[PDB]
Design a protein around this ligand. Sequence first.
Ligand SMILES: O[C@H]1[C@H](O)[C@@H](O)[C@H](O)[C@@H](O)[C@H]1O
Ligand SMILES: [Mg+2]
Length: 274
Amino acid sequence: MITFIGHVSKDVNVVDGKREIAYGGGVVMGAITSSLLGVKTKVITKCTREDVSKFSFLRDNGVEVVFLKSPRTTSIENRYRESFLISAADPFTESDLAFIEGEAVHINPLWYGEFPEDLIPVLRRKVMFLSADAQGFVRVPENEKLVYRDWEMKEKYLKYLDLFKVDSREAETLTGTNDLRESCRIIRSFGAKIILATHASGVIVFDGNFYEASFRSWSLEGRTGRGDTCTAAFLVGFVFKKMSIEKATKFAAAVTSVKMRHPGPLRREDLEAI
Ligand SMILES: O[C@H]1[C@H](O)[C@@H](O)[C@H](O)[C@@H](O)[C@H]1O
Ligand SMILES: [Mg+2]
């Protein structure tokens, strides 16, 4: 099994002054990918009881979901690449981790404070393969605006992670350089064993050696959840399907490409084009 931990979100997407609502989040994108790829998948999330029916499609895609109690549901406004945290569900606490099973857990937060760093060592002791998304540690609400700030305790916590996911902007925030390969070297030097980095043209995986695969297709509306899809597909390929790191890198790129053809999470029919 793989478990994703993170908030679902009512996304308010604003394009040319037009507001459109999507029910998503990192965990939705990632969990649907792994489930459709044939790995037993669980989500631990928080939202209001009222909003649970907006996320019922998870169960329709084979995902076991634990909807934990919160007085609010996280909602993020995205202006097209600037984001605002409109509302925030309660953060995760240690007790939310109590029923963790499976070979793999991915920490997939939307905002710094959603998943307190103290949970990292607690979770480490419960799982064989622990991964996290940098978004949850560098994207910080300041008067709602989600600003990029360095992760002060990155050197302490990266050493707990088997895999760490970044995009260009997160990598630069953590390293001071916009050279993505160099950022990977620097981030691995902080202690993370494997770095997975997404950028416009494809995927870079670094474990001491670099592996790269380019995306084969893309769309404007399809880019949200690129990284979450890519991470989940890499985890499936490498952790569960026993692929070499090089093969799992190409696999993750292929799965991401077909998801990026449309808005929303990976669809069953996408896997017939890969
Ligand atoms: O990766 C994206 C990103 O964090 C967006 O700002 C958020 O609104 C989406 O829910 C998420 O899938
Ligand atoms: Mg991302």
